[PDB]
Design a binder for this molecule. Structure first.
Ligand code: HEM
Ligand code: HEM
Ligand code: A1BT1
Ligand code: A1BT1
Ligand code: H4B
Ligand code: H4B
Ligand code: GD
Ligand code: GD
Ligand code: ZN
Lengths: 405, 407
């Protein structure tokens, strides 16, 4: 078992949970590929073993291992798989599986929250219009006027003979990115492709920097259908800075609800290609990545010039000073708007507690160091000094191919 | 296959074909990645194996100088084969030593400074016989490398390990280290990283100081002898008092650091030969001092002191008081080293040069071993280009390796 050391405190643990890793990552003894964004490519006997492992996980979690109920469920799944090629989760299993998939997500620093997840069962959904109803109710619930609640809506599983439900958008709220003739982008460069797809499917584009995109929702064996989110459903936070009064004149904003909509939820061998989940933001996602990445909104140099910093030389650390003030603006602004947000110090401190909890509960915790350590102030947070073991457990959230490629 | 490597800021793709030549194995498997572990397990302690590494190294060298298959290449292979058959080991020509030292630096996956790898002064101390002579070589190294603040990269190579004879070892992890004194309540005065070496110095007859920045003596070990204590002449040890360009009280904190980072506890491996004492030096990247050495909770841990002096709100994390204090400490380090005319590189400039290194190496060797977690600076990670660069980590030889402490 891997020996895992915390270098700030000197404490050592062994990750025995890693021995239960259900899938291969990209590393080998000859070379580590832990820094790759995409670590992977993108039946009945294999389905059964994954189903049985999941059922065993479920009955262990409720302290009913070996019960008549545990045995009946194993037999039932085995017989349903033999008779139909697949099986159906019970509602309690779906809830357990969604929470486990979150708990198992190595790149998520928010997992101290994993037990608190509202699971909306949309496995009866039959149309894109109904998907939009479920999505709008999810957004309303999760937003909760700014007191954000973690939630997942689970649409019907993949099944043979039938196309997938898919949400083409990578998140439920995305700002349009409009590519300009000189190669530049107006709006969010991360969303140029989904923006062009929306336009190709009839959306009349805006021309602002923070135009909320419509949803492209795909029902089985149907082209995607375009749905506009009612603007009163999309809570947004205008960004200002508590002591840099011109900052508000930048016209920057971000949305309250991070709701990831393009990942595949895998439970017990069953695949849910549409299972959007939302929580709340860690401020560096907005203030550091979304606003200061050179290939995103890239506001760093404008902010530094407005702060009267000397941007001619790197050694004044104008980039660092400007980035800190932008993160302050995000934190101050979400708090002023009474929208749940967590700074990276509080978040990483809670993740350390989560690692402690998971060592006792499961003997380890899969974690992706490069994603857990925040993008500013890395070694000022406890996770920087914490060795981590990255491995794939199921249930899981997984990347999946885009449905237009 | 060959790992596909993407830069996510610009979208450019490379394939790392060099990783297919990786010699030793790392700690990762398909089941779980251990890339974040400081010690990728292992450590240190047949003519066939040595001859195999020697030939691969000689072949590497003669390829690098465009003389593969030449008469000189064949003659050198035969010399090495004949030396190992006669003596069980062999001797590097001085040109091969220099090449080997530079390649070991080039191959170091955790070094962000490798754009400099071809500029390395190599002092050949393989004739060294005594700890006293080791001290003379070390002082000359420090004097050359310090160069009155105009730091020059250098390595001094002491005699190789050989059967039936102890190693030369420098016990200190760096040539310049500040003492760490354990207090009666368990706290540390000075650098907590150096408590163990400080106590070893006291054990071997060093009269300790009681300051926060006492430069430690050197414990130098000649083969089969106990380590010998040597005091560095204070005029050899250039130090920079830390001040801040605008925070006038910062100077009164009495913080300082030394000019010369000179790593003295790593093993240099070239063509199967092992040099357990081969201290190397360059110059600092400022985050090493301002972020890690001074702000790590288990190092000097001064961040909250500085935040107090800055009148920051320190009982709400979301004021980002830690981040603001950290930046000003890094500003103070940069300002102070530039004021003292001591070479230093900020983390923006260093990571930008490392991207250029990656580009040079892709053309030169088809790849570059890099350890993402160590290349990305400990503050402002995604503000630097390396954050957005996928990297492949693997072990090439020649190499600098960790080795067990000699005691
Ligand atoms: C409740 C507050 C939460 C916070 C503060 C939080 C924080 C984060 C952050 C900062 C990341 C890195 C994202 C990036 O850099 O792109 C992340 C990733 C992730 N989160 Fe959480 N999260 C929360 C809730 C959730 C929930 C409710 C789920 C699912 C039920 C979830 C599943 C994931 C997954 C699967 C990833 C990996 C995404 C990827 O690989 O691209 N998180 N989270
Ligand atoms: C010339 C300026 C140089 C700069 C700015 C530089 C910068 C750095 C930094 C920031 C690290 C990480 C150290 C840490 O965080 O503890 C590092 C590691 C390293 N450097 Fe360089 N370096 C330079 C020169 C050199 C030279 C001359 C050598 C050897 C000949 C070298 C070999 C290494 C090695 C082997 C490591 C890995 C250390 C470890 O694994 O503990 N560097 N360097
Ligand atoms: N897919 C492409 N790259 C690409 C770019 C970025 C990513 C990271 C996606 N993470 C978004 C995300 C995921 C999970 C959590 C968050 N945050 C939250 N707080 C949160 C969200 C829900 O609950 C909490 C945010 C992944 C891939 C690509 C390739 C070509 O074009 C585009
Ligand atoms: N020593 C312990 N841990 C420990 C602590 C630190 C390390 C890594 C040390 N890197 C020092 C280093 C190495 C290479 C480069 C630099 N910087 C430079 N710019 C530089 C130096 C030479 O040329 C440029 C600095 C490794 C292990 C320990 C273990 C148990 O108890 C205590
Ligand atoms: C190349 C590198 O893996 C990539 O930029 C990663 C690094 N760590 C990250 N960490 C988080 N949380 N989010 C990210 O998008 C990334 N990107
Ligand atoms: C646990 C983790 O690997 C450890 O804290 C690493 C992270 N990255 C680092 N990067 C550098 N340059 N130096 C370090 O000491 C570390 N420490
Ligand atoms: Gd102001
Ligand atoms: Gd005062
Ligand atoms: Zn790995």
């Amino acid at each position: 078992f891997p020996r895992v050391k915390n270098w700030e405190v000197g404490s050592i643990t062994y990750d025995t949970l890693s021995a239960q890793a259900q899938q291969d990552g990209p590393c080998t003894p000859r070379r580590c590929l832990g820094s790759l964004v995409f670590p992977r490519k993108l039946a009945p006997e294999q389905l059964l073993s994954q189903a049985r492992d999941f059922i065993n996980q479920y009955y262990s979690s409720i302290k009913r291992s070996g019960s008549q109920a545990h045995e009946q469920r194993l037999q039932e799944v085995e017989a349903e798989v033999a008779a139909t090629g697949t099986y159906q989760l019970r509602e309690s299993e779906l809830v357990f599986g969604a929470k486990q998939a979150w708990r198992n997500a190595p790149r998520c620093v928010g997992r101290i929250q994993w037990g608190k997840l509202q699971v909306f069962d949309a496995r009866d959904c039959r149309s894109a219009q109904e998907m939009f109803t479920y999505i709008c109710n999810h957004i309303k619930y999760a937003t909760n006027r700014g007191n954000l609640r973690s939630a997942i809506t689970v649409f019907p599983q993949r099944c043979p003979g039938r196309g997938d439900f898919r949400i083409w958008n990578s998140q439920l709220v995305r700002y349009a990115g409009y590519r300009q003739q000189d190669g530049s982008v107006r709006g969010d460069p991360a969303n140029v492709e989904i923006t062009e797809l929306c336009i190709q499917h009839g959306w009349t584009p805006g021309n602002g920097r923070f135009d909320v995109l419509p949803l492209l929702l795909q029902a089985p064996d149907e082209p995607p259908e375009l749905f506009l989110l009612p603007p009163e459903l999309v809570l947004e936070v205008p960004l200002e800075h508590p002591t840099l009064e011109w900052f508000a004149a930048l016209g920057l904003r971000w949305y309250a609800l991070p709701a990831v909509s393009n990942m595949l939820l895998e439970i017990g061998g069953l695949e849910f290609p549409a299972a959007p989940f939302s929580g709340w933001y860690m401020s560096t996602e907005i203030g550091t990545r979304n606003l200061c990445d050179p290939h995103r909104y890239n506001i760093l140099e404008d902010v530094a010039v407005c702060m009267d910093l000397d941007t001619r030389t790197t050694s004044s650390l104008w980039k660092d000073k400007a980035a800190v003030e932008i993160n302050v603006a995000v934190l101050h602004s979400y708090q002023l708007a009474k929208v749940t947000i967590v700074d990276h110090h509080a978040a990483t401190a809670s993740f350390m507690k989560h690692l402690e909890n998971e060592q006792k509960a499961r003997g380890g915790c899969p974690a992706d160091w490069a994603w857990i350590v925040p993008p500013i102030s890395g070694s000022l947070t406890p996770v920087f000094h914490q060795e981590m073991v990255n491995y794939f457990l199921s249930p899981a959230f997984r990347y999946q191919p885009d449905p237009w490629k």
